[model samples]
Target: SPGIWQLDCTHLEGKVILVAVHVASGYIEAEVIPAETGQETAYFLLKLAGRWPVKTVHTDNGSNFTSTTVKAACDWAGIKQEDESMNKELKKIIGQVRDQAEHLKTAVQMAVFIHNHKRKGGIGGYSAGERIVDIIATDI
Candidate 1:
């Protein structure tokens, strides 16, 4: 339960992309949803809960996240709720790229890949993707 995270949503032409970023590792998971409703957020959370041992979730003051549906989902999953800033780093990276709506999914995927693969001096000079892989490999 060490994987604390934050969620952010970006709206494009016809779809909404949800980003879940690990606060410490900087590894990201993103999905495209129809809208930014509580239900959609809960759906994404449910899916994530199955894959990762999420401890706490941080969100901005978004209307959709304030609803009971998403709240209940987090409660049932044993994921604590907290307040945090929107993912400005992610917003900036994705915002700077230009792509067609048809390739939006690919663009987001590639962006996350690039972000995670970038080596940083913070984590012993290992990339975010490398750190994540090590954690999973060692079951830490």
Candidate 2:
């Protein structure tokens, strides 16, 4: 429930966007959209909920949030969307603003190795062919 909603505000852009997530799981159910009226916001809500099972949605009382589309989505999905003006209810995950950064690449092995007993399940206990068989079996 703590991470269910977030108030995203860009100081430079002077735009306030609301973001909501499934509190029980870290699934990103929806993204930000610009709406001149409540109708647009409503459609975005419907599109998101229609695609997935959203337990609860959160937003503000802004007209864009009270459009018919949003109301329909909430009603159809039986979702309870709450409105909050203060940012204290939801967790705020801030993004870092840096001028410059560096990237690095690394290599990794895709599989793990498991050893078997000397008395294995074949004519030969441990042979090159047996290792190959193990690799093939694990590949699937």
Candidate 3:
């Protein structure tokens, strides 16, 4: 099954972001968390998983990802978490977007939509949806 997902955390003007990627489709699901904790990280991870079929979830080998709460949550949901590099290109694209601190979350979501829907000129001008159309369409 190619239903793989990756999870990572980034910051936007000091606001925490839970960055998730659907590997095959390049679809991104992002969240703005106030302060990251082990439990909250897992909470946000599960939220991301709920968006699609999560066979295995990938994240950096951070303490927050290795805590008991995270492990237990994955076990409970029959999902697996592994250590791998998240999407660097996605982060780079996200970094390009800047906004006021008051609206950082909005900007992050907008960035996510741009990545998923916009045509990537570097990739032969195909959008994420265009590349993974059937897979995503039937899933929805």
Which wins on lDDT, candidate 1 or candidate 2? 1
Query: Which residue segments of model 2 deviate by more than 4 Å?
Result: 1-12, 83-140
TM-score, predicted candidate 3 vs. hidden true structure: 0.76
Model 2: per-residue Cα lDDT over 1-140, one tens digit each: 32233222222233334444333332232233443456655665666566644556666456665667767766876767786222222222221211222311000000001111123356645632244335435644
Candidate 3: worst 10 consecutive residues by lDDT?
Answer: 84-93
Instruction: Locate the minimum summed-lDDT window of 10 residues in model 1.
Output: 84-93
What are the lDDT scores of the predictions, listed in order?
0.77, 0.40, 0.73
Query: lDDT order of candidates, best first?
Result: 1, 3, 2
The TM-score between candidate 1 and the true structure equals: 0.76
| Best of the two (1, 2) by TM-score | 1
User: After superposition, which runs of candidate 1 have C-alpha atoms over 4 Å from their true positions?
Assistant: 84-97, 121-124, 133-139
How much is 79 displaced in model 1, in angstroms? Answer: 0.8
Error of 2 at 71 (Å): 1.6
True-structure lDDT of candidate 1 = 0.77
Each prediction's TM-score versus the true structure: 0.76, 0.42, 0.76
Whole-structure CA lDDT of model 3: 0.73
